[PDB]
Ligand binder design. Sequence first.
Ligand SMILES: *[C@@H]1O[C@H](CO)[C@@H](O)[C@H](O)[C@H]1NC(C)=O
Ligand SMILES: *[C@@H]1O[C@H](CO)[C@@H](O)[C@H](O)[C@H]1NC(C)=O
Lengths: 49, 49
Amino acid sequence: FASVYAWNRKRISNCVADYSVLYNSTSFSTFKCYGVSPTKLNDLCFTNV
Amino acid sequence: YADSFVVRGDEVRQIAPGQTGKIADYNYKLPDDFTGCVIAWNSNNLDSK
Ligand SMILES: *[C@@H]1O[C@H](CO)[C@@H](O)[C@H](O)[C@H]1NC(C)=O
Ligand SMILES: *[C@@H]1O[C@H](CO)[C@@H](O)[C@H](O)[C@H]1NC(C)=O
């Protein structure tokens, strides 16, 4: 992973966002969304990720 | 009524209305119009061997 001052940016396109494949792999300590409700993420499409 | 169970330390944040994740999706769900209180505490001295 990069350093905080020289942080990295990556582009994501042409993919299916099924975040249930992370359940057995990862454990998260912080998850917060701002402009959208977390229960509506399975029903949307995203533009310029 | 009183409900009791055990989870990880990183999964306490999911016991709240409007949350997503493995625990909220498949294990334990709360209503949107919930009236009550939520309590949690560490239990390492008893539940770990
Ligand atoms: C989930 O991950 C654990 C640990 O890597 C592994 O033992 C288990 O087989 C995995 N379960 C599935 C369904 O892949
Ligand atoms: C990251 O990917 C490797 C395989 O390249 C896998 O062994 C490892 O468990 C993954 N780590 C997580 C936490 O997803």
